[PDB]
C-alpha cells in the first residue's frame, strides 16, 4: 500500500529533497550583473517556440525571494534541496576574461548559507542548460572543443567559492535532453536542427558535454576533494523503455536499444570509456571518437550518479541523417487500446510508477553504479485557469504520483539497488521550457497573478508530515 | 489628410491626454490598507469570468510605479492624464465607518504631486466600476438607494484632501457598462442577470448611480466650488448609431431609441430631469421614477460631460423581462456584406472614425450641452504573442485610428461643438477586465514578462510630436 509510504520505511540516512533550476525560478535575468544565456536569447528572439511567448527575465523571482523559498524549504521539512548555479550569473561572458561576478557569487553563498542555518544540504549542479550567451556567440558553445575549459574553469570558480560548504556537486543535468531538443528536434535553446544538421551536432554536443563532464569532475578529485571532502556525479534524463510485445526478440533489442540511445549515450562513456555498441553500429563514422586519454579520464568519473524519471514507452523496431531515426526504433503508448499508463497535465507523461523501479535496476545491472540519487521525479497538473487556490492546489493526482514512485524506489533498494536519495521534481510551479508557466511540477504552488506568491499544495504537506525529520 | 492633423488645428487652449482607472494599473491590491472591491472578488472567486483567469492583484503596478508613470507622461507632453481614485483605497469598508486610510490618500498626493511638478493637470474620476466590497456586501452596493450618501461622503473627502490641487472631476466613468454588464448580462462585478434579474436591477443600478452622481455634483457646486475653482462632470459610454437602411422611417427611428437606450438614459435626466420618453414607453413599470427634488438635482448637474467612444453599429428595429429586449432594436455590421468598419483586434470593435464626429453632433443637438470632453477614444492591438518588441511597438493601425478619430473630433467643431480637449485610451497597455491582459490598448507597451517595463509605442511618439505643449 503505497499511501502509506513514509521516511520509517527508508535507512535512517536516506536523503529526501526537492529541486529547481537557475533558468526556471530565478529571474533577476539582468538583475546583479548577470549577463545572458541561450535560454534568455531563444525566448526574446523567438518568443514563438514557447507557449504564451513568455520568458524567464523574471521567473517566480526566487533571486529576489530565496528567503522566502528558504523559509519554505525549512517548514517542508525535508534534508535537502538540489538547485543548479547560472553559469552567466558568476561570469556573464562565460570566459574568466568576461569579468568575475562578485555579486552572482554573493546570491549563491547567501542562498546557501540561508540552506545550512536552517539545517538543508544544498545539492549543486553546475549546468543546467543556461549556456553563456558569450560562448555561444564566440565559439558555438557546445558545439565547439573550447567549451572543455571554459566549463572546467567555471567548476574550479564554483568549488573555490563554495565548495568550504557544498559537499555534493553535479557537473550536468540531463544533457540529453540539452543535446536532443537543443540540436535534434531544435525545440530548445539554441533552437538548432528542425543551420543545424540533427545527423552531426547532437553527437558532437554530446561528446563535449561528456568531456566538459569528466575533465570538470578531474578537477574536482586532483584539486579539490581531498581538502573541501565533498562528492561529484551528474544527472541523467531516463524514460523506461518497454518491449511492444513481451515475447518479441525482436522488441526486447528495440527497447534495450532505445535505452542505448538515451541513457547509454552517457552511461557507456563513464563506464568503460566508449559508447554503446549498437551506437557504434548504427551512427558509424557520425560518432566521435574518443582518444585513448579522454576514455581513461571518463571511465569512473563519478562519485555517484543521479536518475531524472518521469514516464515510460513501448518500444518497437522502425521499419538525411537524424539522430532520431539513428536509434531505429518506433515508440508506442498503448497495447490493444490500454496506455502504458494514464496521461498527467501533459500528453507525453504517461504514468508507469513500476518504470522508476525497472530503470533503477537497469542502471545497476548495465552499469554497475555503486551510489544513485533519484534527483527528479514528479508531475504536473491539468491545465485549468478556472480554479482558485483552494481547488487548485488539492493535488490528488500528484500526491498519489509521488506515493506511488517513492514507493517503486523502495523496491528497487529491495532489488538491491543502493539509492542514497531521491528528490521530488520540483519544488515550485516555474517556467517549463517550450511549456512556459502552464506547466505546472511544485509542490508549492505559485500565484503568476500576485507576485509569485507560494502556498504549499497538499502533495508538499504529504512529505513533510510523512519525511519530516 | 487626417495624417497631418496637429496640436495646431486646435484652440490654444486645447487639452490632449491619455487615460488609466485605478483597477486596471494600480495593483497593490492588499497594499498600504487598501481594502477589496467587487473586482478583486469577482476576479478571485469567478476566474472563469476572465480570460486567462487573471485579476487586478498586481495589474501593471503602478501603484508602486507611479514615478515612472509620470515620467513618461512627461516624456509624451501632453497637457493632462485622466485617472480614478479607488474608492476602497482611501475607504477600506466603503463608509467613513470603515476608516479612513491616511496611505491610501498618501498614494494619491503623490501623485497628484507629481503631475503638478511636471505641468500636467489631473482629471479625477471617483468612480470607476471598483464599488468598495463592504458595501456590496452589506446592502447590495448601487442596488440600494443607501450608496447614494455613502457615495457622497466618499466623494467629500476626495474633494477636501485632494482639491486644492484638482480642478477637473468625474463622478462616475461609463455608469452605463457597469450597469448592463454588472446586472442584465452578468459578465462584468458583480456579475448578475445572466440571483439577479436583467430585466429590473440594471434600471435600480442606473437610478442609484444617477442620484449618486447628482448628489455628489451639489455637493461639490454647494460645499467646495467657490473655495476650490475646479469643475464636476460625469463621463458616458457611447457608440454610434446608424439606421441599417438610411431610406427607412424604422431604422431610423430604431437607431434613435438605441441611442436613447445607451446614452439618453443618463443624459435626458441630467438635461430635464427626467429618462428619455422611448424609455418610459417601453420599460413601463419597472422604470423607477424621480421625486421632483431629485428632477431639481439632476437637471444641470454637470460643468462639462465626458464622452467615450470607440466604434459603432447599425441598427434595425427588432421582431421574461430583459433590458436588452426591452430596447426592441437588432444591431447589424454589415450592409451588403460590407461591414460599417473592419475589425481592430476586437471582433466588436469596428472601425469607423466619423462615428465620433457623429456622435459629438448628436450630443450638442439632444442635450444641448455647453462644454464636452471626449473623455476616452482609443483601439486594441491584435493578439500575438509571437511578436518581439520591437514588432509589437509598430502600432500603424493604432496610430491611423488616433489620426482619424481627432481629425473627426476637430470635424465636430467645426459643426460647432464645444469640445474643449481629447483623452486616448489608454496610457499604458493594462488590465481589460473579462479579455483580462491579452487585449492591449496602451500607447505606451508593457512588458508582462519582465516587471510591466513600459516603453513608448510608435503612437506614443507621434502623439508627443504632434501635440507636445
Request: charged share 20%.
Given at each position: 500500500?503505497?499511501?502509506?509510504?513514509?521516511?520509517?520505511?527508508?535507512?535512517?540516512?536516506?536523503?529526501?529533497?526537492?529541486?529547481?533550476?537557475?533558468?526556471?525560478?530565478?529571474?533577476?535575468?539582468?538583475?546583479?550583473?548577470?549577463?545572458?544565456?541561450?535560454?534568455?536569447?531563444?525566448?526574446?528572439?523567438?518568443?514563438?517556440?514557447?507557449?504564451?511567448?513568455?520568458?524567464?527575465?523574471?521567473?517566480?523571482?526566487?533571486?529576489?525571494?530565496?528567503?522566502?523559498?528558504?523559509?519554505?524549504?525549512?517548514?517542508?521539512?525535508?534534508?535537502?534541496?538540489?538547485?543548479?548555479?547560472?553559469?552567466?550569473?558568476?561570469?556573464?561572458?562565460?570566459?574568466?576574461?568576461?569579468?568575475?561576478?562578485?555579486?552572482?557569487?554573493?546570491?549563491?553563498?547567501?542562498?546557501?548559507?540561508?540552506?545550512?542555518?536552517?539545517?538543508?544540504?544544498?545539492?549543486?549542479?553546475?549546468?543546467?542548460?543556461?549556456?553563456?550567451?558569450?560562448?555561444?556567440?564566440?565559439?558555438?558553445?557546445?558545439?565547439?572543443?573550447?567549451?572543455?575549459?571554459?566549463?572546467?574553469?567555471?567548476?574550479?570558480?564554483?568549488?573555490?567559492?563554495?565548495?568550504?560548504?557544498?559537499?555534493?556537486?553535479?557537473?550536468?543535468?540531463?544533457?540529453?535532453?540539452?543535446?536532443?531538443?537543443?540540436?535534434?528536434?531544435?525545440?530548445?535553446?539554441?533552437?538548432?536542427?528542425?543551420?543545424?544538421?540533427?545527423?552531426?551536432?547532437?553527437?558532437?554536443?554530446?561528446?563535449?558535454?561528456?568531456?566538459?563532464?569528466?575533465?570538470?569532475?578531474?578537477?574536482?578529485?586532483?584539486?579539490?576533494?581531498?581538502?573541501?571532502?565533498?562528492?561529484?556525479?551528474?544527472?541523467?534524463?531516463?524514460?523506461?523503455?518497454?518491449?511492444?510485445?513481451?515475447?518479441?526478440?525482436?522488441?526486447?533489442?528495440?527497447?534495450?536499444?532505445?535505452?542505448?540511445?538515451?541513457?547509454?549515450?552517457?552511461?557507456?562513456?563513464?563506464?568503460?570509456?566508449?559508447?554503446?555498441?549498437?551506437?557504434?553500429?548504427?551512427?558509424?563514422?557520425?560518432?566521435?571518437?574518443?582518444?585513448?586519454?579522454?576514455?581513461?579520464?571518463?571511465?569512473?568519473?563519478?562519485?555517484?550518479?543521479?536518475?531524472?524519471?518521469?514516464?515510460?514507452?513501448?518500444?518497437?523496431?522502425?521499419?538525411?541523417?537524424?539522430?532520431?531515426?539513428?536509434?531505429?526504433?518506433?515508440?508506442?503508448?498503448?497495447?490493444?487500446?490500454v496506455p502504458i499508463g494514464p496521461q498527467s497535465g501533459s500528453d507525453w507523461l504517461l504514468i508507469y510508477p513500476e518504470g522508476?523501479?525497472?530503470?533503477?535496476?537497469?542502471?545497476?545491472?548495465?552499469?554497475?553504479?555503486?551510489?544513485?540519487?533519484?534527483?527528479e521525479n514528479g508531475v504536473d497538473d491539468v491545465k485549468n485557469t478556472n480554479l482558485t487556490l483552494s481547488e487548485a492546489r488539492?493535488?490528488?493526482?500528484?500526491?498519489?504520483?509521488?506515493?506511488?514512485?517513492?514507493?517503486?524506489?523502495?523496491?528497487?533498494?529491495?532489488?538491491?539497488?543502493?539509492?542514497?536519495?531521491?528528490?521530488?521534481?520540483?519544488?515550485?510551479?516555474?517556467?517549463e521550457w517550450g511549456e512556459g508557466y502552464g506547466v505546472r511540477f511544485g509542490i508549492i504552488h505559485i500565484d503568476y497573478n500576485?507576485?509569485?506568491?507560494?502556498?504549499?499544495?497538499?502533495?508538499?504537506?504529504?512529505?513533510?508530515?510523512?519525511?519530516?525529520?
Open positions: 500500500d503505497a499511501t502509506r509510504i513514509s521516511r520509517s520505511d527508508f535507512p535512517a540516512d536516506f536523503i529526501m529533497g526537492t529541486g529547481s533550476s537557475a533558468y526556471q525560478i530565478e529571474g533577476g535575468a539582468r538583475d546583479g550583473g548577470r549577463g545572458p544565456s541561450i535560454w534568455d536569447t531563444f525566448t526574446h528572439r523567438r518568443p514563438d517556440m514557447i507557449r504564451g511567448g513568455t520568458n524567464g527575465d523574471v521567473a517566480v523571482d526566487s533571486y529576489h525571494l530565496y528567503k522566502e523559498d528558504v523559509n519554505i524549504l525549512k517548514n517542508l521539512g525535508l534534508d535537502a534541496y538540489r538547485f543548479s548555479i547560472s553559469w552567466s550569473r558568476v561570469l556573464p561572458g562565460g570566459r574568466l576574461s568576461g569579468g568575475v561576478n562578485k555579486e552572482g557569487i554573493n546570491y549563491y553563498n547567501n542562498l546557501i548559507d540561508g540552506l545550512l542555518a536552517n539545517g538543508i544540504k544544498p545539492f549543486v549542479t553546475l549546468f543546467h542548460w543556461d549556456v553563456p550567451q558569450a560562448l555561444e556567440d564566440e565559439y558555438g558553445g557546445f558545439l565547439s572543443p573550447r567549451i572543455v575549459d571554459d566549463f572546467c574553469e567555471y567548476a574550479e570558480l564554483c568549488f573555490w567559492e563554495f565548495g568550504d560548504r557544498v559537499k555534493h556537486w553535479m557537473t550536468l543535468n540531463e544533457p540529453w535532453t540539452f543535446s536532443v531538443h537543443g540540436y535534434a528536434t531544435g525545440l530548445y535553446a539554441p533552437g538548432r536542427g528542425r543551420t543545424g544538421n540533427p545527423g552531426t551536432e547532437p553527437y558532437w554536443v554530446t561528446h563535449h558535454l561528456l568531456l566538459a563532464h569528466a575533465a570538470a569532475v578531474e578537477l574536482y578529485k586532483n584539486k579539490f576533494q581531498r581538502g573541501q571532502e565533498g562528492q561529484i556525479g551528474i544527472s541523467h534524463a531516463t524514460q523506461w523503455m518497454e518491449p511492444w510485445d513481451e515475447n518479441s526478440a525482436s522488441d526486447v533489442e528495440a527497447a534495450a536499444r532505445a535505452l542505448d540511445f538515451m541513457l547509454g549515450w552517457f552511461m557507456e562513456p563513464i563506464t568503460s570509456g566508449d559508447y554503446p555498441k549498437s551506437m557504434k553500429k548504427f551512427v558509424g563514422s557520425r560518432l566521435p571518437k574518443f582518444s585513448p586519454e579522454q576514455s581513461k579520464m571518463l571511465k569512473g568519473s563519478y562519485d555517484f550518479v543521479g536518475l531524472n524519471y518521469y514516464t515510460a514507452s513501448y518500444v518497437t523496431n522502425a521499419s538525411n541523417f537524424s539522430y532520431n531515426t539513428d536509434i531505429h526504433v518506433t515508440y508506442e503508448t498503448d497495447r490493444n487500446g522508476i523501479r525497472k530503470i533503477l535496476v537497469y542502471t545497476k545491472k548495465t552499469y554497475n553504479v555503486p551510489l544513485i540519487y533519484v534527483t488539492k493535488d490528488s493526482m500528484r500526491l498519489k504520483y509521488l506515493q506511488d514512485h517513492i514507493f517503486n524506489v523502495r523496491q528497487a533498494m529491495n532489488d538491491g539497488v543502493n539509492v542514497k536519495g531521491y528528490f521530488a521534481w520540483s519544488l515550485l510551479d516555474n517556467f500576485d507576485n509569485f506568491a507560494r502556498y504549499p499544495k497538499d502533495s508538499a504537506v504529504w512529505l513533510m508530515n510523512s519525511f519530516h525529520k
